[PDB]
Design an enzyme around this catalytic site. Structure first.
Site, PDB file in Angstrom:
ATOM      1  N   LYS A  34      -3.976 -10.165  -7.728  1.00 45.96           N
ATOM      2  CA  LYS A  34      -4.756  -9.575  -6.648  1.00 45.96           C
ATOM      3  C   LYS A  34      -5.729  -8.639  -7.355  1.00 45.96           C
ATOM      4  CE  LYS A  34      -4.636  -7.292  -2.147  1.00 45.96           C
ATOM      5  NZ  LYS A  34      -3.949  -6.224  -1.368  1.00 45.96           N
ATOM      6  N   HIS A  76      -3.739  -3.343   7.570  1.00 47.66           N
ATOM      7  CA  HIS A  76      -4.729  -3.696   6.556  1.00 47.66           C
ATOM      8  C   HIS A  76      -5.333  -2.404   6.037  1.00 47.66           C
ATOM      9  CE1 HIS A  76      -8.708  -4.826   4.979  1.00 47.66           C
ATOM     10  NE2 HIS A  76      -9.248  -4.106   5.948  1.00 47.66           N
ATOM     11  N   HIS A 110       0.756  -1.257   0.000  1.00 47.24           N
ATOM     12  CA  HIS A 110       0.000   0.000   0.000  1.00 47.24           C
ATOM     13  C   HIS A 110       0.792   1.317   0.000  1.00 47.24           C
ATOM     14  CE1 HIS A 110      -3.529  -2.461   0.486  1.00 47.24           C
ATOM     15  NE2 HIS A 110      -3.073  -2.973   1.616  1.00 47.24           N
ATOM     16  N   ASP A 167      -8.499  -0.741   4.617  1.00 48.87           N
ATOM     17  CA  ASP A 167      -9.908  -1.097   4.629  1.00 48.87           C
ATOM     18  C   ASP A 167     -10.700  -0.493   3.487  1.00 48.87           C
ATOM     19  OD1 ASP A 167     -11.657  -2.808   6.115  1.00 48.87           O
ATOM     20  OD2 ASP A 167     -12.840  -1.010   6.576  1.00 48.87           O
TER      21      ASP A 167
END
Length: 124
Positions: A41, A119, A12, A121
Site C-alpha cells: 500500500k 476512510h 489507521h 481522507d
C-alpha cells in the site's frame, strides 16, 4: 471480509504509542497491519489518539471529502499522526516506507449506525 469500520481501525489506529517510535515504525506497522500482503500500500496514515477521540471526529467539522462526497469531518483539534509512504528501493514483496511524524487535523469519512470513521481522507 471486513466491516468498513474494522478496516479503518486496522489501517489507521495506533493508540499504543504517543507518536512513531523510530524511523522503522512504518516498515514495522505496514507489515503487521497486513498492508503489504498483496501489494505495498503506497500511502497510509496512523493516528496516535484514543479510538474514542478519533470516532468523535464524526461529530466535529463537516467538510467535503476529496472526491466531492459530503460525509467527511475534520477534527477541531490537531492529533498526533504518522504518515507512511513508499520510498525508492521499495518493490513488492519487499516494501519499504518513509516514516514522517506530525501533529495535524485529520479528515475522515463517516458512515453507519453508530456513525464511525470508514476512510481516512487527509490530514491538515
Amino acid at each position: 471480509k471486513e466491516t468498513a469500520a474494522a478496516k479503518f481501525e486496522r489501517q489507521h489506529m495506533d493508540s499504543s504509542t504517543s507518536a512513531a517510535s523510530s524511523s522503522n515504525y512504518c516498515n514495522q506497522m505496514m507489515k503487521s497491519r497486513n498492508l503489504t500482503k498483496d501489494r505495498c500500500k503506497p500511502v497510509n496514515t496512523f493516528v496516535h489518539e484514543s479510538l474514542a477521540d478519533v470516532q468523535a471526529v464524526c461529530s466535529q467539522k463537516n467538510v467535503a471529502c476529496k472526491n466531492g462526497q459530503t460525509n467527511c469531518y475534520q477534527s477541531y483539534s490537531t492529533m498526533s499522526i504518522t504518515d507512511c509512504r513508499e520510498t525508492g528501493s521499495s518493490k513488492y514483496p519487499n516494501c519499504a516506507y518513509k516514516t514522517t511524524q506530525a501533529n495535524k487535523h485529520i479528515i475522515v469519512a463517516c458512515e453507519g449506525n453508530p456513525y464511525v470513521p470508514v476512510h481516512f481522507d487527509a490530514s491538515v
